[PDB]
Each structure stands twice: as structure tokens, then as C-alpha cells.
Design a protein around this ligand. Structure first.
Ligand SMILES: Nc1ncnc2c1ncn2[C@@H]1O[C@H](COP(=O)(O)OP(=O)(O)NP(=O)(O)O)[C@@H](O)[C@H]1O
Length: 136
């Protein structure tokens, strides 16, 4: 299986902020890995999932075809998915993928992890490296 092990902020982003957005944007995904990330911040920050309907917010379902899930709330929007997936989401909003964030995604892969990318609105806040539960 795949689980988030570490997250890194994008260009000018704080690591704590990145872990938090990955957690709430995963509350809406029904994939088992989306729970793996909600754990990742849990052990690192010891925080709890955020109730979207208590904020009158919305969950954004996770689809594998785009490889993306997220969450919407009355003051923010969050999206997370594959690096190619997030780049397309930013361009549709009209945002851009910062070089530093693309570099963090690649170093996540060069390290044998699956780099997901997380954005807020149309800009990437950080990249997430997942360790593989199973490895040959
Ligand atoms: N909680 C999540 N939210 C957004 N994206 C995720 C999440 N978990 C994983 N992803 C990314 O979405 C990709 C999965 O997309 P996809 O290839 O369509 O599913 P899949 O791996 O074939 N499904 P499975 O058969 O269970 O492995 C993963 O490789 C991650 O990079």
C-alpha cells in the first residue's frame, strides 16, 4: 500500500501548513491512502480531522482517473493529487507550478517515494513524499 511519510512546503511555504491542508483535503477522499495522509499530520502534529459540515464546508471526492481529491470551505479551497494532476488544476484556475515545488516532487521520487502535490486555490503549498508499505 502507499502512505504519506513526509511533506515539504512549496516555495515560501511552512511545513506545518502543508501537512494541515493535505489532511483536510483528504477527509473528502474515500481512498485508503487519503487516510494514510490524515495520519501523517496526526503523528507529526497530533491534530484531528476537521468537520466540513460543521464549517458548512464541502468534501471533494477523490477520483483515480485524475488522481485528485480536495475540500472546500467557507473561507478556503484545497486540492491534492498527482503532480501532473495538480499542474493541470493550477492552469485551469490560471495559476502556475513553481519550479521549487516541481523540484520537491522529483526529489520525492528520486528518494523512492510517491510525490503528491498539494495546492490552495490554484497555487501549490507543498509536496508530499509517500513511503511504500510493500517493497521488493
Ligand atoms: N488521498 C488522496 N488525495 C488525492 N490524491 C491521492 C490520494 N491518495 C493517493 N493519491 C494519488 O492518486 C494516485 C492514484 O491514482 P490511480 O492510479 O487512478 O489509482 P490506483 O493506484 O490505480 N488505485 P489502486 O488500484 O487502489 O492502486 C496515487 O498514486 C497518488 O499519487
Amino acid at each position: 500500500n502507499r502512505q504519506a511519510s513526509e511533506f515539504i512546503p512549496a516555495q515560501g511555504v511552512d511545513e506545518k501548513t502543508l501537512a494541515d491542508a493535505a489532511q483536510l483535503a483528504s477527509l473528502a477522499d474515500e481512498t485508503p491512502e487519503g487516510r494514510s495522509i490524515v495520519i501523517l499530520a496526526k503523528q507529526r502534529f497530533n491534530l484531528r480531522e476537521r468537520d466540513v459540515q460543521s464549517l458548512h464546508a464541502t468534501f471533494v471526492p477523490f477520483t483515480a482517473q485524475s488522481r485528485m481529491s480536495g475540500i472546500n470551505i467557507d473561507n478556503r479551497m484545497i486540492r491534492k493529487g498527482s503532480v501532473d494532476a495538480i499542474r493541470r488544476h493550477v492552469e485551469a484556475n490560471g495559476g502556475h507550478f513553481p519550479t521549487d515545488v516541481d523540484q520537491k516532487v522529483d526529489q520525492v521520487a528520486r528518494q523512492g517515494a510517491t510525490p503528491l502535490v498539494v495546492v490552495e486555490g490554484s497555487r501549490v503549498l507543498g509536496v508530499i513524499a509517500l513511503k511504500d508499505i510493500v517493497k521488493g
